[PDB]
RNA sequence: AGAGAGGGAACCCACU
């Protein structure tokens, strides 16, 4: 985490730019020093100083602002904050230190080390389990109208926004669907920002595969088992009216989490859930549609299996399934939060500061509270 | 223009006829942008003095006063855009009256408060 | 009427005054540990 | 608010009007003695 | 006609708002992005937002775009409703002041003398101080010995005395302050202030009678109240209906023998029982004394509640006796007879004769 | 918490030599919070960036490069969840992968590789948070881990042969939950790579030990196959409850209650894996002559007679520390903490207790007896309206905790974040079993 | 011989 994470987190943060002569401000060299105290003069405060005067044994956080105004000024070991250091660590004092050594810092070498001292008081992060990640799973909703749902919680690795799981549901209904004309089972996906049950026939025609033949080349890779095709069908066929990209990305606009205005200024929001919304783990950029076409149409052919019963359903409980959230993922999830803040609280002060028409004191900018 | 705006917060009083609002540089500089013609302010500051109120309440900045209803309540529909008064209270002495009516312009009181 | 104290890591004894702030004169170290009372302590054996 | 303070299991009603806090009561561990009667408990002095 | 939206805006700070949107509208009227709205309302006592007039929503969006004050409005906004316009620009309105600012705040200043220039006027005040003895308070006299004493920023001048931030002060502070600084209008000091320098009350459930009109000699019960023209509900005597009468009209009778209280005046505060009933002279007597205490029969009031009117203890002891001998010990509690012992060695704290102990 | 349910909280299958199938929380926390098993190790992960390369470099299409045609006779292959393409050939692709982590030359040993046979399927894990186990590699019905590797491997600190020499050897090598779905484990080898009526005769990995199954609280139990598991779960609850020298710097921290022992014992009856948590140098209780007896009646319902003449020799008398910390606060002048002996005649709200047990600075000097509402700090905090008479500063003091008596210990005085002068006082009480 | 106590809320680990 400390190694290489946190210089990820700062990295993927995008350089911030203020529009008046614009100037925008980015980080990219962190530095990570030792735990040090202080008012005071720098001394290396040692593990158990820290435990006995409720100290925390937390190391300062340098790192280099580079901002273009363009008239550009870089400014290194800018000190951005504490973070906290569990001991026995790779930046803790006591690291490959000598049994002797450790017995001269009143630290006895039976202390595993892998905790915090947070004012005085030792703190261990749990590993929290969860879903494993951009892993298409097969379940049953027994008692809801779905008889097959999957699921895929994608969330791209060094993403500071979290997971967006989209559902691909069938519609279970058996026999007719309530109705004198709808016979089949059709298939419906749950995207992310989206609170309509959206068809995946207008998913594929929304990401620039009008044709039928071609959509169902990207489901189902064999053509000579009719009855996948068979099954397949009735979803197929719901959504014969709607044949143009455009007519697919209005119907995908269409009950959005945040409703579109006209045709336009919701077309380019359809085109941002499809582009930014589902599936990051397959690739956020213009040329990444037929990679998700390629991804959809596996979770939904795994969906037409489950369906089939030639794949069986995947349990929950295995942990092949599952992922351990150790202090690292976990301090990464939180340092993404409070970079973002820190961020936030940078851009409100060169907000405040540009319309004086003065220029932004940067170390008032970068307040170390918020990030400690 | 942007000499009709006030220029800070400080000293800011209304005209007692139009009840625009300027500081007391912009008056003593520039007297009245609508009416200094009837008035002759600039150049003078107790004529700024006698013609102009300390007490007002509420601000309007009117930008489009042919299409503005509050012109239409306020009566300065005719006038030219920028920064005028809601209420004002002060009165013109009655020879500055007197000569304003010998050209042609009656004097409409600005204080359309509710006294009570 | 000065407390005498133990100065942490220097292992050596300084006076202390009330309203002094906690220094070491040896190397100024912030951890003070109390000299054992000179009362009788007395311990049944059991 | 009031509410809250009166509809739970810590509120008036239950946590203060049917099941209170009372005064001469002892909680201490139990340890088995077999010569004294079935209506008899031992209790500590310091209890007592 | 347009219409005028909702905007909210920081606190104390519309006006400069304002200004700064009628600088933008003459920075773009000769742009291509200009202004559609058509005017911009911030009211002097309106704290937190203004108005924006225009045809359309969007025109309001767009024109307060880049305006940072007005951020916390920028997403939605509310029209005010049509029959409600014309409250928006609706305006309602040796003397003694109240300070506006500074720790004098709200204090009784009396106008000693108004300088004629119409910038400030002389105060007499009380001084809020601690004669720079605490700061490194409610109102007392000026104590120039104390001030003399503790020293700091103060000068002599026999009764006359500078002080503390030029603070000006004579046997009483008489300093300078502005007029728009201080408020010259609605103050009415009291009693008390003028020595530091008609009326209704009727309550339900006082009797009254009528002294003129054709209801005149109607004795009923009050049962409401109002400010000055009441138009009262009083429950007569042998009838059902409530009639009206005002303020003006009646008058505070009570029949001989009941609770009285005094509401105002000298006599305030007692109580007792009224005797006989005179054109207005009304002689009670009180529940503590039996003084004639003759009334107005408006300062009557009918209230039926009644009248207020050892040496061992921590020392440490040696056990020199019994099975305890030899162990040293702490006393917490001692008597006459017999001592507890905190022992040092045991967990416990036993009791002994005094006649075994021995002190260190 | 509180859910009817029990799927989350069962013992699953893929819970084998992961997680211990003992240790849990007994309470309304059963199954939910675990304990992780011995050699279970969680990958940290690494980038895939290298995994994709190699891929590349092989005869592996990309999506982007493909007929939707020849999709159905190949195997789909995954990293990360991301699929990145087809391969014709998914033997002497798993082969090679393998090939090249049983080496260490582009993979990490972390990463995983998962053949899905029956569906076409080929996917590498490179995620962080996967839990994984060293296993040993079966090449024949032989064993990689030969002669040689423990001669290596017994003279360590010599040839500095670690473990890690061990694993860039191909020997051993990490096998993950999605992994252990195909793969033949044997379980022991003098058992199941000699030839008999023969079960698989195809094993791939075999366990390295099955007592590594377990945790760290369910190591310490001696013979724990002979148990029931229900007495197994208590034992690990009770493990982290036992008395004992918790760490070796005890004299220095200044912890809230410290439980230590005065003659803790290894156990006569041990386990191969308590010479790596370590429990014969940091034991916690006394090997002692138990007799399995009826008797007078006080051993009757869970319950045990003990011998009081041993326990007089220090038998299980133990020392129970406790600390106690304080500070005074410099605010706004109008209330101002400050460490000193408090005056009945000066201070104001003094409760009746001993106050010339404390020094001349409002603290006790350590080797002082004190008992139940005994002072330890005396601290004082100031009164506004000591001016707004003749009463001044009330008492804010921290008695000793009630019901409770002992020796303080040791006394520290220091200053604390905010530069206030603070102390902490711990006090001693023996506790002889009664 | 000068005699009473207060915090309060929140969240973790166990105990039967
Ligand atoms: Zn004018
Ligand atoms: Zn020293």
Same mark, same amino acid.
């Given at each position: ?372 | ?116 | 009427? #000065? ?17 002094? #702030? ?25 | ?48 | ?114 300088? !004629? ?59 300078? *302050? ?18 530091? *320098? ?47 009468? !005002? ?49 107005? !029969? ?24 019994? !099975? ?37 | ?6 799927? +989350? ?49 092989? =005869? ?6 493909? =007929? ?260 005074? =606060? ?11 002996? +408090? ?92």
């Amino acid at each position: 985490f400390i190694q290489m994470s946190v210089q990820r987190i700062v990295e993927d943060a995008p350089p911030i730019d203020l529009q008046p002569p614009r100037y925008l401000l980015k980080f990219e060299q962190i530095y990570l020093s030792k735990p040090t105290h202080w008012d005071g003069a720098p001394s290396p405060m040692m593990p158990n100083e820290a435990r006995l005067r409720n100290l925390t044994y937390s190391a300062p956080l340098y790192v280099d602002i580079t901002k273009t105004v363009q008239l550009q000024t870089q400014h290194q070991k800018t000190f951005i904050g504490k973070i906290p250091i569990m001991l026995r660590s790779t930046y803790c004092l006591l690291n490959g230190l000598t049994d002797r050594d450790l017995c001269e810092l009143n630290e006895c070498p039976l202390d595993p080390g892998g905790y915090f001292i947070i004012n005085g008081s030792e703190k261990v992060l749990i590993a929290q389990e969860k879903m494993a990640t951009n892993t298409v799973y097969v379940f049953a909703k027994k008692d809801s109208k779905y008889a097959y749902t999957g699921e895929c919680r994608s969330c791209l690795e060094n993403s500071s926004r979290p997971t967006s799981t989209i559902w691909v549901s069938m519609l279970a209904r058996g026999g007719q669907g309530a109705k004198k004309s709808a016979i089949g089972q059709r298939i419906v996906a749950t995207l992310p920002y989206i609170k309509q049950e959206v068809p995946i026939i207008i998913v594929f025609r929304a990401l620039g595969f009008v044709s039928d033949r071609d959509i169902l080349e990207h489901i189902i890779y064999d053509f000579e088992d009719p009855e996948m095709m068979e099954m397949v069908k009735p979803s197929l066929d719901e959504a014969f009216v709607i044949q143009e990209q455009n007519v697919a990305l209005n119907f995908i606009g269409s009950r959005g989490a945040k409703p579109g205005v006209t045709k336009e200024k919701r077309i380019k929001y359809a085109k941002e859930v499809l582009q930014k919304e589902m599936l990051p783990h397959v690739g956020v950029s213009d040329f990444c549609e037929t990679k998700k076409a390629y991804f959809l149409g596996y979770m939904v052919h795994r969906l037409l299996l489950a369906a089939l019963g030639r794949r069986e359903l995947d349990d929950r409980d295995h942990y092949g399934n599952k992922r351990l959230d150790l202090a690292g993922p976990l301090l990464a999830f939180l340092f993404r939060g409070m970079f973002k803040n820190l961020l936030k609280e940078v851009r409100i002060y060169a907000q405040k500061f540009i319309d004086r028409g003065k220029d932004f004191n940067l170390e008032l900018a970068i307040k170390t509270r918020i990030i400690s | 223009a942007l000499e009709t705006v006030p220029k800070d917060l400080r000293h800011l009083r209304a005209c007692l006829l139009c009840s625009l609002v300027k500081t007391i540089d912009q008056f003593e500089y520039d007297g009245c942008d609508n009416c200094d013609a009837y008035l002759q302010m600039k150049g003078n500051r107790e004529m700024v003095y006698d013609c102009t109120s300390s007490s007002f309440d509420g601000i309007i900045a009117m930008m489009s006063p042919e299409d503005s209803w509050v012109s239409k309540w306020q009566r300065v529909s005719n006038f030219k855009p920028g920064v005028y008064a809601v209420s004002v209270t002060g009165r013109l002495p009655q020879g500055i009256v007197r000569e304003l009516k010998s050209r042609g312009v009656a004097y409409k009181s600005r204080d359309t408060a509710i006294k009570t | 009427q #000065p407390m005498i104290y133990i100065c942490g890591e220097c292992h050596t004894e300084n006076e202390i005054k009330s309203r002094d #702030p906690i220094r070491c004169r040896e190397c100024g170290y912030r951890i003070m540990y109390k000299k054992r009372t000179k009362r009788l302590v007395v311990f049944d054996a059991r | 608010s009031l509410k809250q303070r009166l509809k739970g299991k810590e509120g008036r009603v239950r946590g203060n009007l049917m099941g209170k806090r009372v005064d001469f009561s002892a909680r201490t561990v139990i340890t088995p003695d077999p010569n004294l009667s079935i209506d008899q408990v031992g209790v500590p002095r310091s209890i007592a | 006609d347009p219409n005028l939206w909702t905007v909210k805006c920081k606190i104390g700070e519309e006006r400069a708002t304002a200004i700064s949107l009628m600088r933008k509208f003459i920075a773009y009227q000769f742009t291509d992005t200009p202004l559609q709205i058509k005017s911009v309302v911030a009211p002097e006592h309106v704290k937190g937002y203004i108005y924006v007039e225009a045809y359309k929503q969007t025109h309001v969006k767009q024109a307060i775009e880049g305006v940072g004050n007005l951020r916390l409005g920028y997403w939605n906004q509310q029209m005010v409703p049509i029959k409600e316009m014309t409250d928006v620009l609706k305006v309602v309105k040796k003397s003694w002041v109240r300070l506006k600012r500074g720790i004098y705040k709200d204090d009784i200043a009396q106008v000693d003398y108004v300088e !004629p220039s119409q910038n400030t006027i002389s105060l007499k005040m009380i001084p809020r101080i601690d004669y720079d003895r605490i700061k490194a308070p409610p109102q007392r006299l000026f104590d120039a010995e104390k001030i003399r004493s503790l020293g700091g920023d103060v000068a002599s001048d026999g009764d006359f005395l500078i002080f503390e931030g030029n603070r000006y002060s004579r046997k009483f502070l008489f300093k300078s *302050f502005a007029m728009s600084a201080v408020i010259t209008e609605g103050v009415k000091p009291t009693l008390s202030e003028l020595e530091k *320098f008609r009326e209704h009350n009727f309550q339900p459930g006082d009797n009254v009678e009528v002294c003129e009109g054709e209801l005149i000699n109607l004795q009923g019960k009050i049962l409401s109240v109002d400010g000055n023209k009441i138009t009262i509900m009083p429950k007569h005597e042998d009838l059902k209906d409530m009639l009206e009468f !005002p303020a003006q009209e009646l008058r505070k009778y009570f029949k001989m023998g009941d609770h009285v209280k005094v509401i105002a005046g000298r006599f305030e505060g007692d109580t007792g029982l009224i005797v006989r009933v005179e054109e207005n002279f009304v002689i009670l007597f009180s529940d503590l004394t039996m003084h004639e205490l003759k009334v107005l !029969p408006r300062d009557l009031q009918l209230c039926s509640e009644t009248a207020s009117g050892n040496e061992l203890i921590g020392q440490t002891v040696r056990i020199s006796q019994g !099975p305890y001998k030899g162990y040293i010990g702490v006393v917490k509690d001692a008597t006459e007879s017999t001592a507890r012992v905190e022992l040092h060695s045991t967990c416990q704290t036993i009791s002994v004769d005094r006649q075994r102990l021995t002190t260190v | 918490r509180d859910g009817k349910l029990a799927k +989350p909280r069962q013992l699953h299958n893929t819970l084998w030599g992961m997680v211990c199938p003992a240790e849990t929380p007994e309470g309304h926390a059963v199954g939910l919070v675990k304990n992780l098993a011995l050699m279970a190790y969680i990958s940290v992960g690494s980038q895939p960036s290298p995994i994709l390369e190699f891929l590349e470099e092989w =005869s592996m299409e990309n999506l982007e490069e493909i =007929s939707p045609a020849a999709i159905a006779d190949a195997t789909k292959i995954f990293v990360n969840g991301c699929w990145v393409g087809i391969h014709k050939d998914p033997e002497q692709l798993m082969n090679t992968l393998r090939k090249l982590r049983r080496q260490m030359d582009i993979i990490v040993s972390e990463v995983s590789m998962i053949r899905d046979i029956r569906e076409r399927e080929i996917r590498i894990y490179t995620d962080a948070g996967r839990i994984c186990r060293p296993l040993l590699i079966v090449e024949k019905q032989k064993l990689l881990l030969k002669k040689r590797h423990i001669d290596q491997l017994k003279e360590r600190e010599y040839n500095n042969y670690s473990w890690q020499d061990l694993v860039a050897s191909g020997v051993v090598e990490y096998i993950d939950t999605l992994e252990e779905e195909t793969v033949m484990l044997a379980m022991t080898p003098d058992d199941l790579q000699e030839k008999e009526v023969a079960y698989c005769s195809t094993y791939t990995h075999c366990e390295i030990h099955p007592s590594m199954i377990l945790g760290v609280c369910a190591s310490i139990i001696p013979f724990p196959d002979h148990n029931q598991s229900p007495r197994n779960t208590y034992q690990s609850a009770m493990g982290k409850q036992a008395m004992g020298v918790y760490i070796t710097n005890f004299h220095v921290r200044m912890d809230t209650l410290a439980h230590v022992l005065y003659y803790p014992q290894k156990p006569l009856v041990t386990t191969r894996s308590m010479e790596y948590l370590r429990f014969r140098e940091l034991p916690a209780g006394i090997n002692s002559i138990v007799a399995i007896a009826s008797y007078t009646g006080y051993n009757q319902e869970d319950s045990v007679i003990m011998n009081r003449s041993a326990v007089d020799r220090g038998f299980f008398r133990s020392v129970f520390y406790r600390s106690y910390k304080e500070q005074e =606060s410099k605010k706004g002048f109008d209330q101002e903490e400050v460490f000193e002996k +408090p005056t009945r005649e000066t201070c104001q709200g003094m409760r009746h207790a001993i106050y010339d047990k404390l020094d001349d600075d409002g603290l006790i000097a350590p080797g002082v007896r004190v008992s139940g509402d005994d002072v330890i700090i005396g601290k004082t905090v100031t009164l506004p309206e000591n001016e707004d008479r003749r009463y001044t500063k009330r008492d804010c003091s921290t008695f000793l905790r009630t019901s409770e008596t002992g020796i303080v210990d040791q006394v520290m005085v220091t200053l604390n974040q905010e530069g206030y002068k603070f102390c902490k006082i711990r006090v001693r009480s023996v506790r002889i079993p009664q």
